A = this chain, B = another copy of it.
């Protein structure tokens, strides 16, 4: 069946904006997972999970009688797809159970792990999501094996179809670098937004870069990929050595024995894959990665044995039974237990990437400190495990249940508690009047609130106007935010704030975070007034101001908009067409195609463009809220051509006279080109639509203002 994608493989795909509709969701439209989870008996779930750890099933027998290692790996793979560049991946949507992640080579036999959990999932039903359960099970595994965790939050609602994520362009699983779709270029520079070294891996190749077993060069890949998942050196050593304190790898025979991954397997396999022809195909004969390493003398108990072995032996390069590169301890006794035969013992072994923790000079210093101070290792690993598994969950207001850690961590982009009465409707009206009386323009007010609110991304629920981080480093200096204009707006707003707060009795005060948004609302109201419409824009107080010390400047860098079609902004020249970057931004902002359409058309006529560019400002009444963008865009009296100077900028001229009427970018003119976006533009550009446009604009404006407002959820 030949499809539109076949005929026109480069046409913009909007269906990413209409994923996760009410159609595909089995739960009713009013289902509220937070309310279901809050009533769950989490303690009972945890008792069932503890019991599961040593309830071995014959179709996938437990190594050492204990599934803990398998489940820690499962939870670490669930979280381990996360990329800081876009916030996509991570554990927060339970995407491990869908394509393609359910079938990535690095997730082999995690289909078994998830299936072991079906009886518990089934028992508790909608009160615990798969997404939460995968993480909880990892926690319980740790606790079962003697490791005290830092805590756990519930609240990850299940999703019902695959997320659309760019995982790379390679057409071959696990393809080594330098191919026609190479994710590397230059001096081993991995293309953004990717955070793995090969298609179908979590972070790095356990044999070494492109399979070459050099622990020092492996360390460079580890550092880069882990940093692209928001982890620093200390967290990275703590995680890898913490994890490999438990369990084992599986490589008992050649990988050619292993059959189709789950999405390719026959229907009779009932959702499982990697069926193996090697001996029993499971247990002592299991094949997963192809490596055959067991790190510690007590693989089912927390210990300090990982760093004792790493430093205590010298290492020799050898091959697993499947042919993979791994290491064995020179001259060692057979001290490591076998997973099934009490009469067998094995020498200590390690992966290339384990040796990285010793032979990279910066990791060596950390590893040595953890070896000498095992309590530092345990605390670091607990904290890093919590971060790993919660990094995409968003603000602390989303965290549910009785095990939430009280300690507030820098990586959570924390927001101070509000300890005072909030402004009411009369106050908001007074503040809006003061804002409009100050002389701040519609363009200033709309631009500033847009800049504050539109840093939100739904992928990891970071960003948004809560916190007033626009006034701090680094947001105050982002090019998109027009740093000099921004400073003048903020100065004026802070004066208004100080005067209002100084006049209050009791402890009533307004945050700058709230006032920035309320001021934007006033701008939109004034713009509607300019166009002859009487509009009140909703506003919900309760944001607080974060401090600079509560704002990690390095971690904030990934939120910088280098492309924001809603402000007709592109920081540089990119491979990806600007319209593709627009749809990508709309998806991060959780907008549908209609919402994207209405919002962009309104922003253009309100003066939200960066640099006061005329591109796409298709109105003779700037700073009035009208549907002029759509009416003028769709006027067939105007003919469009790319400029001689810049093929990505277009001139619209009167067809009869040749007079210049407008200029526009690709982001502007895509709404007149793409057949689905033009259909939407037509609705808003029709003679009966001025009021619909205004109302739909106010709604999407308010949606964007409230994207991070989980304190209201």
Interface residues of A (CB under 8 A from B): 1-2, 4-8, 11, 14-15, 17-18, 21-27, 57-59, 97-100, 102-103, 115, 118-119, 121-127, 158, 160-162, 166-171, 181, 199, 262-271, 579, 592-594, 597, 631, 634, 636, 639-642, 650, 655-656, 666, 669-670, 672-676, 678-680, 682-689, 696
Contact = CB atoms under 8 A, between A and B. Distances in A.
Complex copy number for this chain: 2
Contacts of A682: 118, 121-122
A171 B26 contact: no
A594 B685 CA distance: 36
Across the A-B interface, the 4 shortest Cβ-Cβ residue pairs: A125-B688, A21-B21, A125-B686, A18-B23
A171 B2 CA distance: 7
A161 to B, nearest CB: 6
Contacts of A121: 682, 686
Contact of A26 (B115, B125, B161, B684): B684
Contacts of A24: 14, 17-18, 592-594, 676
A7 B126 contact: no
A516 B684 CA distance: 46
A689 B31 CA distance: 13
Given A4-B99, A11-B99, A118-B634, 20 more contacts: A1-B169, A2-B168, A2-B181, A7-B263, A8-B264, A15-B161, A26-B680, A59-B655, A97-B679, A98-B676, A119-B636, A122-B631, A122-B634, A122-B685, A123-B686, A127-B688, A268-B642, A268-B650, A269-B673, A271-B674
14 contacts: A2-B170, A2-B181, A5-B5, A8-B103, A8-B263, A14-B161, A26-B597, A26-B683, A125-B683, A126-B686, A263-B675, A268-B641, A268-B650, A270-B672
A122 B631 CA distance: 9
B271 A672 contact: yes
Contacts of A687: 122-125
B59 A636 contact: yes
A122 B679 CA distance: 11
Contacts of A158: 679
Nearest to A592: B23
Q: For A579, A641, A676, which residue has the most chain B Cβ atoms within 10 angstroms?
A: A676
B58 A675 contact: no
Contacts of A669: 267-268, 270
